[PDB]
Design a protein around this ligand. Sequence first.
Ligand SMILES: CCc1cc(OCC(C)(C)CN(C)C)cc([C@@H](Nc2ccc(C(=N)N)cc2)C(=O)O)c1
Ligand SMILES: [Ca+2]
Ligand code: NA
Lengths: 250, 28, 5
Amino acid sequence: IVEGSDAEIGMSPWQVMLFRKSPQELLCGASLISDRWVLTAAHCLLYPPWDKNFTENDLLVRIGKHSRTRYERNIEKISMLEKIYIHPRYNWRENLDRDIALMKLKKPVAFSDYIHPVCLPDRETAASLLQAGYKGRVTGWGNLKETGQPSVLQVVNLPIVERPVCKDSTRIRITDNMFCAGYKPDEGKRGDACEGDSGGPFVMKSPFNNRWYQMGIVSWGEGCDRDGKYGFYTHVFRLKKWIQKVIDQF
Amino acid sequence: ADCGLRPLFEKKSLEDKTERELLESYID
Amino acid sequence: FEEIP
Ligand SMILES: CCc1cc(OCC(C)(C)CN(C)C)cc([C@@H](Nc2ccc(C(=N)N)cc2)C(=O)O)c1
Ligand SMILES: [Ca+2]
Ligand code: NA
């Protein structure tokens, strides 16, 4: 996260760290959606152009974390993966369309002060909240700058951008399965996700029922926090039928 | 049933330092 | 990263 701030304790209790076993390193962000299911970006797991192809045994899930590097004794929980499920129409060849994957944990995680699931939006939530100018919140342990690494979980609040402005900022084809967020040059304020934050949640707090909903997943961007560029996020609601189908079957 | 309600915030009626910024943006 | 038990 570029130009964000340290998270408060328990501020994002659905935050998950995807952690490579060998070598030990941050793979990506992710989010807890029930005691058994974790949501992330497909490209965190599968990206042939970079020869990335992680199998279940290659990584661990770390939940309830604050510190990036510390083993948080009596606080964080470490879970192994039973199965990964990548969207069958994830487009890694071009633009990361449908950048979404689920991971089922081998055993349920116990909820605590530090560990709790986020809600997924329904059609109404999405129509009401996914509006240009409305702000969401992005969290992660990724790079502090485009060109180092944070001590603790970082957080930034960013407005959703009008679709024409998003399209006009890039040569990449933007689909209905994506949205963009970030400040414009003329707005003065700054902030973006960066390398290491992909797969992490973009959340919004409903003013109707005071619950947090995961509206986006950190997908991609061109550099980090550049003027006139915006972060691109997977549209969770648009892909919810696939989410439900996988959880219902598996 | 309890999704999206944080033990250290919503559950105990405490607010984090910047959630108000989000609320203020939700104008319509 | 600190070692995990
Ligand atoms: C697989 C798609 C992807 C591409 C990417 O660009 C990498 C470059 C620009 C350093 C080099 N490219 C040309 C290969 C970097 C990422 C990185 N993710 C990322 C996420 C958000 C933002 C942002 N909102 N500013 C930036 C990056 C990554 O996962 O490494 C992912
Ligand atoms: Ca364009
Ligand atoms: Na920007």
